[PDB]
RNA sequence: UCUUACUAUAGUCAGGACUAUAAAGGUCCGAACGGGUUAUCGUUGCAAAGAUAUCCGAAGAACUAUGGUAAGCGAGUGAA
RNA sequence: GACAUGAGUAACAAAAAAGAGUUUAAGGUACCUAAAAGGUAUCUUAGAGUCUCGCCUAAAGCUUAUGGCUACGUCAAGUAACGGCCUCUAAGUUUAUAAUCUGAAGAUUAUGACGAUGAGAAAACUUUGGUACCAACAUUUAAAAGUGAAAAUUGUGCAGGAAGGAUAAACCGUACCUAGAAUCUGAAACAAGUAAGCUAGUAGAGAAUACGAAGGCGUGAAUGAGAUAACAAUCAUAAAGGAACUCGGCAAACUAACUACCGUAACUUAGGGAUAAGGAGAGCUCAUUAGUCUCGAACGAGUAAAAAGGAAGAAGCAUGGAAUAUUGUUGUACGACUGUUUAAUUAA
RNA sequence: CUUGGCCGUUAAAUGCGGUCUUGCAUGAAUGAUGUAACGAUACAACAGCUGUCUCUAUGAUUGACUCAGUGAAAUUGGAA
RNA sequence: UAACAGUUUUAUUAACCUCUGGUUUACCUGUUGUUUAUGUGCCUU
């Protein structure tokens, strides 16, 4: 459950390390795995995104428990995302870390193909 | 209050459904025959038996 | 808005309420009878029956659980695991009896009741049933089906039963306890 | 399920008022109950206020049947149903759906 | 509003401030006694 | 913790029946002590003359008693011998117009002070068991348990009659290991001689029976100098 | 006493009159040399 | 006999810490004590100025007690 | 002035708390009994007490003041274990005297008198000016040790710390209450306020914090018994997020105390800043012991001795274990600073 | 006039800080100006923290409600 | 034919606790300080 002012760990090679959620796009309820958000970059890593940039992102794993049809429930130790463009495709080229398997049913194929492991 | 309540309206509030209900759930004690409340013990025989079991036991 | 209450709170705090029930049960096992309010007699009933169940267990956990319910255990534990354990050895539950009575305090007019240990030396239903049978024999009246039903209730699990009952009846008759009683054949003609 | 006397938050979803910023004794209260003289100088009918809640008939529509066991005498329906356990409910074919096939209606009568 | 000005008050100050000798031995005190005597007061002081 | 006794019959070490509950008399519940089997014990580690005389003071209005080793009492005796019996019942000090000597016990031996220090111990211990553990007066005699906490405390202060009875008991051999005995262990034992001086001859009758080793006299040394004449019965 | 210095181990109860009461008839805190004897009964005033 | 100032005679300030001192400081942390910062409650109140928490000073220009002096044409007292 | 209405409504909620037996007196009912009486049971009014539970506790306890519309059998030559009266004086007062000033009233100076919150021989028997002084602070001292007073000794700092007199038992006070349970002030039986001493023990540096032995209390029906809706007050916990709340982080939460621990920036009036910041340690068991202490007989043993002690060990999710001490940092304005103020809406 | 211009801080600055000034209407003991230290003064920012909020929920006590006992008040031209 | 595999989102109203969480003041377990009761309890001849 991501909302305004929530901090997330960006796990793509876009240049961002810590981003703050500014808007939940396409809905009023708090964002979960597979939802689009607008973020503001607060920390970088050392056409990369710099601190203060405003980009769109996709929640790839949350700390709130996410239930599935088969009764299984997944939970991560952090909230993470990957930056995207208004077109919907990723900005980076490689993702380091596990992502939520809920990205499959929300039409995020490109984010999954570059994801090493899914949970 | 904006006005003094009249005699008609205060009597309504005091009497309409505020009558004291008569107690009809009464019966007699099987040991002495005095009037008692239903599903209750006789207060006369209670104290008398309570004292009878205190002297000889 | 929330859930219904599990039990009566009796307008008290958690610690106070617990101590209240322990005192009612401590006084019950000490005197075999207590006269209090009906709501208190009904809350101490569930705790008194659960304490007599511990008396019928053989583990040490039960001996420590009974010690934690009474307030003078060193003085009452021998009676619990002694006289009381032998009394209710063949009775499957229902060791207590609550009987509504008139208000114990007339100031408040609070509904009162008597909590007693069945088959005990101060069983009120055992005595009331004896005074009824004593009146019937002294007045040559036929006992009702409800009197016979109670005669069997207060003599089935008792130690001697009928022998103790007939002795209570004989005592009341010799003491003239039924003197001044109203014959049931004259109840229908009395307006007071 | 009955709820007894319910306030305005539970009975109508009122938001309530603030909690710390100076609010005085009005954290769960309904606030204003209407407009001034220009609106009737009265509380209008249908005004949402505290009151009893629940213990009313409630219908859930379009619930499929997943299991049918005659020995146990149960009919397992998907979703939730109004009331507590042990309460009687009325089950009937959905009104917003087509009736069951004619071959089935006649097979049951047979 | 009124205040509790008699809190901690002592009776040694009452006799010094309003006692009989405080008045018979002064020029203005004699007037007080003579005024209260004319009115018929029993309590002329303290 | 505390352990109260019950008013049951028990044996006595004295030669008399100090109480109606006494079963037997002159019973040896323990072998003789180091000084009991000694013809002349002496004050080994005490001042010269200490123990030859023992004084008893009482409140002439309320009955509170105090035991002393010297001819005078101080504020220590009141703090250390008077327990709390209630509010307004324990005096904050000793008032000279209310406290008077009750009696003085003098032993025949003028250098056997150890005998007196023992008699003093048994007296203070008995008094402690009168103010506390008074099971013999709860339902009998004064019936202190049938009274209010106010009247009860006023009766616990009246220790004068009890104190006189303690003397007749302690001087008769009461107490385990009291030096009023004299065991020869040739085994023959006897009681030591003593003298009790009274300001009021009538006070010596609070004891139902006195031993044969005690002689009674009227007048305590020092009272005649204060112009306090003693009270005699025969006039 | 074996150890006499002030900091020595304290094993005594420093509340001497603990539980003692003349109005409640609590009894004596310890067993005395006159505790197993019947309390002498005087003649009342 | 409230209160402001002054005056006389007295009393009180757990414990710890730093500082040049054993004791030299309108020093430090913090009870008693003395204040009354903030918030809530209360507002026909328990109270015509209270309750709870929080906060400030706490060897000093400190606090407190019993007495005394100064007030009503001109103004007594006033760290105002 | 009487009597209505609101209304038989609010209120009888200091976040201590009650439960079950027993008993005395007087009186009211029912029955036994009709020779009254007495007995049994019950109720009303006014009390008492037992067992259990809880609350207060450097108090809501004990002993005493100021005071008192509570009540009058409260008893003293003096010290131990006592004040007044009486002697002496301070601040001051003075319808005393003298002198002086003054529209009268009066005022002033001196003397006298009066005036405690101070000073007053002896007793467990008794009747000059540092050769100093008895303000503060510190130190030392009744010899087994420790602790708290009294008095004295010595010293320190500047703010430089009274006066006077001497040195055979009268009269007055003495009861009760001390503010959480019937008494003082607050219009009162008010959750406020008021002086002194004592005020168990464990544990601590401590009068902090927690428990609480004794004692008292858990109110004069000025209440009691139920039920546990909304809502209010006072609290407790909380998924994910973490100021998005709001005039404003108001309120709440985080943090916290301790160690003779490590370490600590800019700047600076060189004192500070600073307990900066930021880290480490902690309870239980145990190896080990230079001296002290204990036991046995230099030596041996011992923590049923105080302490020391280690990179030792055990168990648990967790050993600042419960309670007690409310964040850190940064840039400005104003005022140097500690202080003071509109008693009771403004504390700056 | 005015949210003065510029810079920093904010995803967004009528705020805060720095800086330039033609300052309706700054100014030198009605003192001018800059630091250390101090502040329950006022303003702004960061970190942490949290039911302040997203968005409330459950639980506890006391009241609220019912029975018994006692028994007010403001108010009231008269009222179907 | 079988088998296998795939077949919207947002918002809103209401009901409902199977699941995921929150709550748990008479449930179980562990644990600190202190008090009370009961039982027990040192060495040596
Ligand atoms: K003149
Ligand atoms: Mg209630
Ligand atoms: Mg508790
Ligand atoms: Mg229900
Ligand atoms: Mg809300
Ligand atoms: Mg209209
Ligand atoms: Mg209208
Ligand atoms: Mg005024
Ligand atoms: Mg005053
Ligand atoms: Mg007195
Ligand atoms: Mg004054
Ligand atoms: Mg200071
Ligand atoms: Mg509030
Ligand atoms: Mg209000
Ligand atoms: Mg400060
Ligand atoms: Mg401080
Ligand atoms: Mg109304
Ligand atoms: Mg109401
Ligand atoms: Mg009410
Ligand atoms: Mg009667
Ligand atoms: Mg005198
Ligand atoms: Mg004089
Ligand atoms: Mg004086
Ligand atoms: Mg108080
Ligand atoms: Mg009063
Ligand atoms: Mg009061
Ligand atoms: Mg304290
Ligand atoms: Mg009291
Ligand atoms: Mg009570
Ligand atoms: Mg949360
Ligand atoms: Mg969380
Ligand atoms: Mg905002
Ligand atoms: Mg907003
Ligand atoms: Mg705050
Ligand atoms: Mg290790
Ligand atoms: Mg482990
Ligand atoms: Mg200032
Ligand atoms: Mg200041
Ligand atoms: Mg003001
Ligand atoms: Mg002030
Ligand atoms: Mg203010
Ligand atoms: Mg100038
Ligand atoms: Mg009522
Ligand atoms: Mg659920
Ligand atoms: Mg379930
Ligand atoms: Mg649950
Ligand atoms: Mg339990
Ligand atoms: Zn009957």
Author numbering:
A (entry chain I): 1 to 46, 59 to 131
B (entry chain W): 66 to 122
C (entry chain L): 2 to 193
D (entry chain C): 221 to 330
E (entry chain Y): 95 to 140
F (entry chain d): 33 to 218, 243 to 291
G (entry chain T): 44 to 88
Give verbatim lines from the article.
Protein synthesis in mitochondria supports bioenergetics of eukaryotic cells and is executed by dedicated mitoribosomes. To provide a representative reference for studying protein synthesis in the mitochondria of fungi, and to reveal how the mitoribosome functions in coordination with its translation partners, we determined structures of the translating mitoribosome from the representative fungal model organism Neurospora crassa. The fungal mito-ribosome consists of 78 different proteins, 23S and 16S rRNAs. Forty-eight bacterial orthologs are extended, and 30 proteins are mitochondria-specific.
To further improve the local resolution, focused masked refinements were performed using the masks for the large subunit (mtLSU) core, central protuberance (CP), L1 stalk, uL10m region, the small subunit (mtSSU) head, body and tail. In the CP, we found an extra density in the pocket formed by mL40, uL5m, and rRNA H84-ES3. Based on the density, interactions and the abundance in mitochondria, we conclude that it is most likely to be NAD. Positively charged residues of mL40 and uL5m interact with the negatively charged NAD phosphates. The pyridine ring of the nicotinamide is held in place by π-stacking on the base pair of A2755 and U2759. Arg295 of mL40 forms π-stacking at the other side of the NAD pyridine. Therefore, NAD bridges the mitoribosomal proteins and the mt-rRNA at the core of CP. By masked refinement on L1 stalk, we improved the density that allowed building its complete model. We identified an additional protein component, namely mL108. The protein mL108 interacts with both the L1 stalk rRNA and the protein uL1m.
